Amino acid sequence: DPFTQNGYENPTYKF
Amino acid sequence: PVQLNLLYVQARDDILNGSHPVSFDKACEFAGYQCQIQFGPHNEQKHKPGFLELKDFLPKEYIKQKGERKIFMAHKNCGNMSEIEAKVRYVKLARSLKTYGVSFFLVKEKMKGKLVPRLLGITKECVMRVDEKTKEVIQEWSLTNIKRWAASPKSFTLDFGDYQDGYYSVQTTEGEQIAQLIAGYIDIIL
């Protein structure tokens, strides 16, 4: 729900 | 590096299968990176002409183009770049493109003279016409510019109201699919 517009995602997740 | 690998694979697949249309010049930049990622640094003693199975490094429309010379140049140009560096670069290149994150359909338009193919792309923010060969973005309409839309089994149509004169009409069998996508992006705003 809160990730519908300014949903920036992290390319280092579980790197 | 799980998520970076997930990203790179998504972006590489979408490019390699035409989901993400890229100009030929970009196809070889991407391939150049892919060569680095899969074979390491370029080594003339090991990467001989004819060795590259182009079906695995280029979208199909471009295999006919004999671009192995171009690919090995971009592969050379990567120097001693690490595998992970090449992946970050691959993803950044894809995302730097207007076409990134855009669902496309291949449709035929009419012109002032025979029906020409054209890539019609939809996102949440707009609707674009894109050149089927060069992939240059030739017209961009904001979604709030669309008065109404309609889909036949053998056509799709846009009415832009006061923003363009004359309807935009298009030969496609996926017309109900293009419009389904658009309606869903409308629904979220309200």
Residue numbers in the entry:
A (entry chain A): -4 to -1, 754 to 764
B (entry chain B): 209 to 321, 324 to 400
From the paper:
Using the design strategy of the β3 (739–749)-talin (209–400) chimera, we generated an APP (754–764)-talin (209–400) chimera, hereafter called the APP-talin chimera. The APP-talin chimera crystals were birefringent flat plates belonging to space group P212121, which diffracted to 2.7 Å. The crystals belong to the space group P212121 with a single copy of the APP-talin1 (F2F3) chimera in the asymmetric unit (AU). In contrast to the β3-integrin-talin chimera, which adopted a homodimeric arrangement in the asymmetric unit mediated by reciprocal F3-NPxY interactions of the two fusion proteins, the APP-talin chimera showed a ‘daisy chain’ style arrangement where each APP tail interacted with the F3 domain of a symmetry-related molecule. The NPTY was well resolved in the density and closer inspection confirmed that the NPxY motif of the APP was binding canonically in the NPxY motif binding site on talin F3. The mainchain density for the APP (754–764) is well defined and the side chains for N759–F764 (including the NPxY motif) could be unambiguously placed. The final model comprises residues 209–400 of talin1 (F2F3), with residues K322 and N323 missing from the loop in F3 that connects β1 and β2. The chemical shift changes upon addition of APP peptide in the NMR data precisely map onto the APP-interacting surface on F3. The crystal structure of the NPxY motif of APP bound to talin identifies the APP cytoplasmic tail as a second attachment site for talin to engage, with the potential to forge similar cytoskeletal connections at the synaptic junction. In this assay, the APP and APP (4A) peptides are fluorescently tagged by covalently coupling a fluorescein-maleimide to a non-native terminal cysteine and titrated with both talin1 and talin2 F2F3 domains. This confirmed that (i) both talin isoforms bind to APP and (ii) the interaction is specific but weak as expected since talin also binds weakly to the NPxY motif of the β-integrin cytoplasmic tail in solution (with Kd in the range of 100–1000 µM).
